[PDB]
Symmetry: C2
Amino acid sequence: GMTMPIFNISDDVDLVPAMPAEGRDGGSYRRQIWQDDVENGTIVAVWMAEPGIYNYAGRDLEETFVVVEGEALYSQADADPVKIGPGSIVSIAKGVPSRLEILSSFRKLATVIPKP
Amino acid sequence: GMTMPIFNISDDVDLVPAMPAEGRDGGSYRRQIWQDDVENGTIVAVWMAEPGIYNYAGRDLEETFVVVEGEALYSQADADPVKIGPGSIVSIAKGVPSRLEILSSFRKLATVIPKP
Ligand SMILES: [Cl-]
C-alpha cells in the first residue's frame, strides 16, 4: 500500500540549522513537519538542540511545544529557570521572551500559530 | 506549573473522560492544553489511553500528534499497520480514517486544526 506520514523525532533528517548556542555558531536545528495552506496557518515542526544557551526575544506568534528527548533549564520573561524534560509541555504567549539552557541533546515538537 | 505554563503529560490533572477502546468502559482521557483565541481555532491537547482498539472515521480536521509514552499498532485508510512509540510523529489528513491498537499505556500530544 502507500506509506503513511509518520516520522521519527529521533532521526536527524532534513534538519535545517536554526539558532546557534551562545558562544559558538551552531547548536539547534529545525525540521518542518506540517503547515496549513492558509495565510498565517498553523505550523508543526521539530526543533533539536545540543547543550548550550539559547535566548529568544518575544515573537509575533503563539507556541506550544512538547519535549520528547533531553533536558533543559527553561524560563520565560523574568521567571527563575525550571528544569524541563521528556513529557514537559510548554506554552508561550505572543511577545514573551524566553531562554533555554539545554542540558542534554534535546528534541521538541512545536506547534506555532502566527500572530502578525 | 507553579510559576509558568509548563505542564507535564504524565499529570492526571483536569482530565476529561474520552471515548474508550471498543471493548472497554474507561481508561481514556483528554486534557486540553491550549486553544487559539479565535472562533474555531487550533487546539493542542493530551490524549491518554489504555490498551485496546480505537477506531476513528475520517474527520473534518487536520491533526499531527507525537507519541510521548507507550506503543501502538497504527494504520490509516488501507495502509498496513506499523508500530509507533515514543518519538513517533503522525499526521492525519482531513477525511482519513485511522485505527490505533494501543499495546501499552499511551500518551500523545495532538495538534488539531479544524477544517470545515
Ligand atoms: Cl513552573
